[PDB]
From Swiss-Prot:
Coiled coil: none annotated. GO terms for molecular function: calcium ion binding; calcium-dependent phospholipid binding; calcium-dependent protein binding; integrin binding; phosphatidylserine binding; RNA binding. Interacts with PDCD6. GO terms for biological process: autophagy; epithelial cell differentiation; membrane fusion; negative regulation of gene expression; response to calcium ion. Annexin repeats lie at residues 1-69, 70-141, 153-225, 229-300. This is Annexin A7. A pair of annexin repeats may form one binding site for calcium and phospholipid. Transmembrane segments: none annotated. One of its GO terms (cellular component) is vesicle membrane. The chain holds residues 188 to 488 of 488 of the full protein. Belongs to the annexin family.
Length: 301
């Protein structure tokens, strides 16, 4: 109620107080940002998101818009917009569908139905094909093994099978990589890759690059890279987003927002090590305006 007043106050009159908007949104959780959305509608009978769309613009607007969406609905929205129309940004389908957990995936499948009236998996099969469709479909099941204990005989056998399905033959037996990489738990996949390094004399990630290509290779490496160090995978994705002239603002916003309340800290510590440069320094050089002030506040203190 008090928070809803400030945003209304900061939008009232000519112009906008963008600093006040940041001081509220960046210092409030997502659960709290939903209760501010609700307190706003009751106090004034207007939607806050629409009033924010009228008085913000550009990267500031989309970063604030992302920050007010519930985490589940945001992912589901992000998946719909990645398939909407002709074309597909399979990078977005990999970043979500290959990195979210079983719990997160099942909420998306529920929210995707109850909000757009569409079948998530059905949408995936139409916008994709090949072994990538199969990989994303497995991802959509949200059915990865959850036992976090290591089964050693399984790790051995699995690696041997992965060895025989790719390197040990001409061509590749893709569904074998689909099976283990989509069914095995993350500590189990880590044991699989350790068994695969000694027997193959070449780590599992390189073999994926050799026997696979395209978005399947990207998707498969994503799962493996997440099994090793999921925060480090995002760090690399954020590094790619701001390297070069300009910024991939869609990605930089999406990763900062979606992982802000999950594992952002570990992403920063990873990013610092992999690049000898804080994630804040990279952003502060690549962004400006209030849009920068919001991004730094979210990483923050
Ligand atoms: Ca309040
Ligand atoms: Ca105004
Ligand atoms: Ca202003
Ligand atoms: Ca509080
Ligand atoms: Ca606008
Ligand atoms: Ca389409
Ligand atoms: Ca594409
Ligand atoms: Ca198809
Ligand atoms: Ca740049």
């Amino acid at each position: 109620i008090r928070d809803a007043e400030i945003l209304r106050k900061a939008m009232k009159g000519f112009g906008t107080d963008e600093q006040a908007i940041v001081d509220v949104v960046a210092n409030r959780s997502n659960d709290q940002r939903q209760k501010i959305k609700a307190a706003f509608k009751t106090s004034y009978g207007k939607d806050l998101i629409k009033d924010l769309k009228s008085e913000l613009s550009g990267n500031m607007e989309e970063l604030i818009l992302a920050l007010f969406m519930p985490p589940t609905y945001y992912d589901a929205w992000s998946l719909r917009k990645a398939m909407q129309g002709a074309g597909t940004q399979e990078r977005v389908l990999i970043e979500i569908l290959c990195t979210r957990t079983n719990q997160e995936i099942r909420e998306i499948v529920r929210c995707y139905q109850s909000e757009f009236g569409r079948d998530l998996e059905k949408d995936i099969r139409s916008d994709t094909s090949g072994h990538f469709e199969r990989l994303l479909v497995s991802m959509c099941q949200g059915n990865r093994d959850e036992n976090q204990s290591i089964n050693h005989q399984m790790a051995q056998e699995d690696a041997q099978r992965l060895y025989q399905a790719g390197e040990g033959r001409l061509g590749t037996d893709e569904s074998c990589f689909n099976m283990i990489l989509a069914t095995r738990s993350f500590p189990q996949l880590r044991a699989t890759m350790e068994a695969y390094s000694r027997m193959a004399n070449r780590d599992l990630l390189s073999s994926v690059s050799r026997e696979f290509s395209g978005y399947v290779e990207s998707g498969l490496k994503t799962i493996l890279q997440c099994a090793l160090n999921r925060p480090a995978f995002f760090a690399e994705r954020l590094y790619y987003a701001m390297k070069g002239a300009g910024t991939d603002d869609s990605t930089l916003v999406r990763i900062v927002v979606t992982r802000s309340e999950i594992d952002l800290v570990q992403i920063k510590q990873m990013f610092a090590q992999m690049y000898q440069k804080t994630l804040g320094t990279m952003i502060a050089g690549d962004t400006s305006g209030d849009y920068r002030r919001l991004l730094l506040a979210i990483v923050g203190q």
